[PDB]
């Protein structure tokens, strides 16, 4: 799809265009556009701006590149991303990481909204993910499919340690720092591809299949990252519960989970802000 | 190099038109006959007949069972349009025009689409020739991007993010389950979990079993892509699979699922399948 | 704008008269050799070698492990065309063309396909260095639409919907479990359910579980293809793994799944393999 060129063409663009020299990329979903309010001697970047970038054409997703320090750390935040349903291939979806890596990047935090598929969830959680479920993958949707280029990494690399171990431990102690009250979540996220959310016959699949929660993006976006040696965490706001029988009335809806993540604009705030303290300098 | 829609709104209108124009019928329910079922057109009255062909964007039908006719009149006494044969995936078409029809049955004024095909059958449950009334679906293809809706979205027709969790029209199912207790037929009207897998090969004994570990009460290869699109633009939606052959669930036996048997099952079930579409009929609410 | 095979059935045709005319040999049986089991052509007399490159229409082989070659000749007496590596999916091939050479065996009079592969164990009884025997599959990309038999068919080569139930060879299976009960090794032969999932990424611990709850024994990214078109055309198929890993199934293990070290138990195996080949030939039947 792209050659090396291209993403050395944004990347220079960028490195270019700002004194900022990112080591965290945060990846804001559906709802979580407010994540760069925090950000210190913000430098904006429009989408249509940079070279080879695709347009977040979804509500929730401002279209947006924003170069900051968070809480000392200094970022690179996508307001907004790309999902395969709007039509992108998922090397489009996941350009960006890449071009992140060439920034000189070595971390990357993933967030989305989530549909929760275990029981013990309610609205309004985060869910630290644990590891994926790639069903767009098993059958041939993975962004590294075709000639694999060494100077981004391995022909095939190992998915198993996806997820931070450490960040994860350090997330899950000073969560007490929060102060609220429904304990840190923890568990599986599976993609599907969307758009039209899940039956009950396919929610009970995904439970059966043993996912915690189910979403339309953030695993190719995991997958392209870790074949570059990025660091990665990621975690889900749980902004609805899936629908499993027959006798409910609820429908999903996604008003509902723009406004779940909203109402919980603040805890993930104070969430983010806690977790850059976490990320160990480079080198 | 974004893999969206090849139809326009005005395509769609275009065909809509060709059709309205063509034909004094002024259908309020859209059927479409699967693998063996072009037989439901049979009872159509003031039939008027399209082949495929002449009308404007539409797919070709090279399925066998698929005559390639789209046909109007009057069933039981409601005004319908029937596409005697439907389009698969398989064929090698993308989802944007196996399910082409669907938005123009809106645009000519439908209000309510039944979806038939045949499945296999993987409740053991289920004799060939039961009918399963569709309560929900599995869209495998779905999970992994083959979806009709993938790329942008056309408010016209709908929201970008529509639900599939009520696809299927709750009242229906319950009019038609109810009538048929008091029909006292031998077996039972069936109920359950369609679920879709691409094909064109049968499945193997350990693809079987992990449709029924999911949760399917049958298996085919059409229906969902044209259940998602109606619900996109808010036609009420009804299913049926005809049960044309258990599919394998072990390696002892000899038999192998195939066309011919499939086809077979379609006219042994006619009756039953006239029968049913009755009461179907008089289970659709009228206009407004 | 169909999404059918983009080969002609003169394509096949060229390269098998290419083929025919370039060497003297008339195989009866191919043999399609997976990662790090290039080896495999090493028992093969009277060999004649053909690049991938030289034979036209033939995709290349761009993975480590994987040679590129077709090598004609005879093994324990019979006549056989082995690929010296494969070609998958994740290397950017359509269905397509990873299985382009099927056709071009059955053109070239082979009757029997011989599938290997490498492959990460599920099942927790399996140990590095088993041959597990293929006793069928599960197709999660043809679920979804990545069948090979997608499009237009070509009745000279096929049906329009093939049954896979009986995909891999009863005979073959029993006779090589007969005679190897008798000869070999003391760690006894294995059996299974090979599940095809696209690459080229490794499995997460969480995908790990959900192919070991399918039923699947062994996962690997090929194989599966190959199969579905040698049984459209009507080959005998036998197929096998090489159990080069035991896939991560728990969050406390600090292993990972690697190509080099897959390659290696190619390597560790390769005298395993050749002794279990022959008695292979042994249970094909020969042509009428
Ligand atoms: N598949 C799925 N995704 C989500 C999401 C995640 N995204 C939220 C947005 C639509 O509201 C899409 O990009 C999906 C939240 N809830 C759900 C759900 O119930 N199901
Ligand atoms: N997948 C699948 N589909 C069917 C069908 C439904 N269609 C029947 C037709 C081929 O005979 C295809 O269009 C699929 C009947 N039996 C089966 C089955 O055993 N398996
Ligand atoms: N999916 C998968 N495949 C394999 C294979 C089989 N092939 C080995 C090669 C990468 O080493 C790919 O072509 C897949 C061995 N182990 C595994 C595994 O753990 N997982």
């Given at each position: 799809?792209?050659?090396y060129?291209?993403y ?35 430098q ?24 900051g ?16 349903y ?18 000189g990047?070595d971390?990357?935090v993933?967030?989305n909204?989530?549909?929760?598929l ?28 075709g ?14 340690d996806?997820?931070d ?8 102690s000073?969560?007490?720092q ?9 568990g ?7 758009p ?20 339309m ?11 570059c ?23 999903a ?21 806690i ?7 480079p080198?």
């Amino acid at each position: 799809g792209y050659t090396y060129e291209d993403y050395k063409n944004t990347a220079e663009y960028l490195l270019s265009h700002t004194k900022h020299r990112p080591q965290v990329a945060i990846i804001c979903g559906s709802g979580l556009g407010g994540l760069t309010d925090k950000l210190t001697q913000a430098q904006i970047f429009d989408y249509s701006e940079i070279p080879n970038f695709p347009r977040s054409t979804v509500p929730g997703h401002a279209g947006r590149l924003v170069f900051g320090f968070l809480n000392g750390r200094a970022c690179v935040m996508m307001q907004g991303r790309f999902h395969m349903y709007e039509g992108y291939p998922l090397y489009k979806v996941t350009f960006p990481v890449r071009v992140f890596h060439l920034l000189g990047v070595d971390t990357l935090v993933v967030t989305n909204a989530a549909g929760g598929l275990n029981p013990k969830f309610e609205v309004g959680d985060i869910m630290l993910i644990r590891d994926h479920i790639n069903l767009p993958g098993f059958s041939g949707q993975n962004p590294l499919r075709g000639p694999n280029d060494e100077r981004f990494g391995d022909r095939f690399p190992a998915m198993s340690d996806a997820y931070d171990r450490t960040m994860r431990q350090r997330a899950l102690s000073t969560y007490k720092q929060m102060g609220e009250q429904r304990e840190l979540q923890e568990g599986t996220y599976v993609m599907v591809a969307g758009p039209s959310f899940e039956t009950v016959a396919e929610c009970r699949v995904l439970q059966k299949l043993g996912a915690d929660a189910v979403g339309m993006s953030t695993v190719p976006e995991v997958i392209v990252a870790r074949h570059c040696g990025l660091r990665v965490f990621g975690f889900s706001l749980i902004t609805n519960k899936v629908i499993m029988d027959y006798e409910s009335l609820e429908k999903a809806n996604w008003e509902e989970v723009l406004a779940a993540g909203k109402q919980a604009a603040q805890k993930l705030e104070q969430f983010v802000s806690i977790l850059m303290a976490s990320i160990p300098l480079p080198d």
